[PDB]
């Protein structure tokens, strides 16, 4: 996935476009919006991702929710540096072997998109 394409909704391939469509739905979650509104200062997305899996579990609902909060911060971002930081931290989270190996073993991004 090109996370810059995803968060900008720009020059998306079909898979990224479908994940983008799912993201959008997710960004309407009341609990997600409330969580976002409670922390307007942009946090470290890589750390958030690693904290989510700190119980030893991962699933596609968690992944979609992490992308969703990332999109919310990206939409409200106040500088290009903030957008670069979001994109790079998402890229770094999903490029960790522990996460990339889970995705590859659980249907790949195509399985996320086929939901």
């Amino acid at each position: 996935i090109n996370f810059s394409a995803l968060l900008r909704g720009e020059r998306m391939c079909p898979l990224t476009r479908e994940i983008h469509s799912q993201m959008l739905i997710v960004t309407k979650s009341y609990s997600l919006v409330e969580t976002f509104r409670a922390f307007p200062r942009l946090p470290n997305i890589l750390e958030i991702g690693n904290n989510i899996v700190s119980d030893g579990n991962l699933n596609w609902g968690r992944i979609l929710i992490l992308l969703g909060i990332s999109q919310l911060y990206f939409t409200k971002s106040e500088s290009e540096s903030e957008r670069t930081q979001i994109t790079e931290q998402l890229e770094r989270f999903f490029r960790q072997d522990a996460i990339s190996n889970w995705i590859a073993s659980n249907g790949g991004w195509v399985t996320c998109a086929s939901l």
Binding site: P43, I48, N51, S54, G61
Partner: peptide, 24 residues
């Protein structure tokens, strides 16, 4: 006091699992 990343993550795990159960 607590890192925001820890507070946010706790909530997102809970929401993510509920989304996983209902829709995934």
């Amino acid at each position: 006091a607590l890192p925001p990343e820890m507070v946010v993550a706790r909530e997102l795990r809970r929401i993510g699992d509920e989304f996983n159960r209902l829709y995934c």
